[PDB]
């Protein structure tokens, strides 16, 4: 237990929370706009995972302003989560290399 780990953990928790909330809020914003395919929860969930992990298939994109704000939230949160976990891994390897040597 250090910090890079103790921050990657919080990033993971908060990402899970944002995927759930984004599913819910995306459904809540998409319903009411004719033509919206993003209007049930179980696929707002898989859409949130495909969007946060920057995959973007493109079969269930949001079509409203608030739905798109929710999408931007999910995108930024996922990018931050994974970049921060990458930083954590880098710090761990730096430590282990500052020991294979001395400094």
């Amino acid at each position: 237990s250090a910090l890079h780990w103790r921050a990657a953990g919080a990033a993971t928790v908060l990402l899970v929370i944002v995927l759930l909330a984004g599913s819910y809020l995306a459904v809540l914003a998409e319903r009411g706009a004719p033509g919206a395919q993003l209007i049930t929860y179980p696929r707002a969930l898989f859409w949130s995972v495909e969007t946060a992990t920057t995959v973007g298939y493109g079969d269930l994109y949001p079509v409203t302003l608030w739905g798109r704000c929710v999408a931007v939230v999910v995108m930024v949160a996922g990018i931050t989560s994974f970049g921060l976990v990458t930083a954590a891994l880098a710090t761990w390897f730096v430590g282990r290399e500052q020991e294979r040597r001395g400094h």
Partner: antibody
Amino acid sequence: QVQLQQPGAELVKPGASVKLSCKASGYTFTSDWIHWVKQRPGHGLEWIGEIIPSYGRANYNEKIQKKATLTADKSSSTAFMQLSSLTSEDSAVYYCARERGDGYFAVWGAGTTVTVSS
Amino acid sequence: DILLTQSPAILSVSPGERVSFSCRASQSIGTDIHWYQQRTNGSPRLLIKYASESISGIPSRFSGSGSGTDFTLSINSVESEDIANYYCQQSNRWPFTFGSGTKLEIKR
């Protein structure tokens, strides 16, 4: 058991407002939407509007007359529809259905035979 | 919106026999179609969810199939209790829509 509970009938003089009530026992999740379905005599089913109570957001059939107003109630798990100022065309059995946010109407109510006549 | 067309509106069948209602959506919607039943002065009964999935309390008599734009609701061995009106309802794009309906007649 019986979960959605609707008054049997309503009579309104042609022009007033009518406020339909639908009360739900059983489970009440936060992901429950409440839909309304107008069924004219001799016609099929026609989707009117939906509302999520655990937030209070309502959508209304933008392709037919959008006179109504769906409202919610925090505790008792009861929803209201505000069909105000009608003609004699707005006379139908009005169903409320519960949807778990997964698209299909699991449970319906008994309906409310709403009658417009002087 | 999405147009659900149900041909024909009236379908007559002799008892103990396989009737097949049909629903056709105005654009591909995958399997987001759901079959309801309603008898005279009754309320809708969810028969099938997502094209081909069962509901508790629904007999094995009722099947359900199809995907994309064409969907089918079948009944092996019709019997008098099946005399009702059958609707399809889609949940793929907003708003949800219903079908025009279809009546089951039994020639006895």
